[PDB]
Write a protein that binds this ligand. Structure first.
Ligand SMILES: [Tb+3]
Length: 126
């Protein structure tokens, strides 16, 4: 069936870089637009909990043909979305990471229903 599996989350120092992956099963990533979302840690405790789990912040997206990408303002220039069609995987490159980027990151596709993966956490902290 349709499945999305995020990986690559880690603890990173401020200013650091990371690449997240979203491995898709059940459909081809080069036939669907794919998006990254996050649920951020808004109370600076290093956890995503409670009302933080009721949020839906769009981070980045790329079109099915691969020729149109978009980013939320707060990450423009710092993050880059790409994909590897052979690995059926979408990536999110992060640079110049900030504490405000601490969040669980989720990839998303619409295959006749709206689907999100189980998420991977990035923590930006000292
Ligand atoms: Tb929290």
């Amino acid at each position: 069936q349709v499945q999305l599996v995020e990986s690559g989350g880690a603890l990173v120092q401020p200013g650091g870089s990371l690449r997240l992956s979203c491995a898709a099963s059940g459909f081809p990533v080069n036939r669907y637009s794919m998006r990254w979302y996050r649920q951020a840690d808004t109370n600076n405790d290093g956890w995503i909990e409670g009302d933080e789990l009721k949020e839906r912040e769009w981070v980045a997206g790329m079109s099915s043909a691969g020729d149109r990408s978009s980013y939320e303002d707060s990450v423009k220039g710092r993050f880059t979305i790409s994909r590897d069609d052979a690995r059926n995987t979408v990536y999110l490159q992060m640079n110049s990471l900030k504490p405000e980027d601490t969040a669980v990151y989720y990839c998303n596709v619409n295959v006749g229903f709206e689907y999100w993966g189980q998420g991977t956490q990035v923590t930006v902290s000292s």
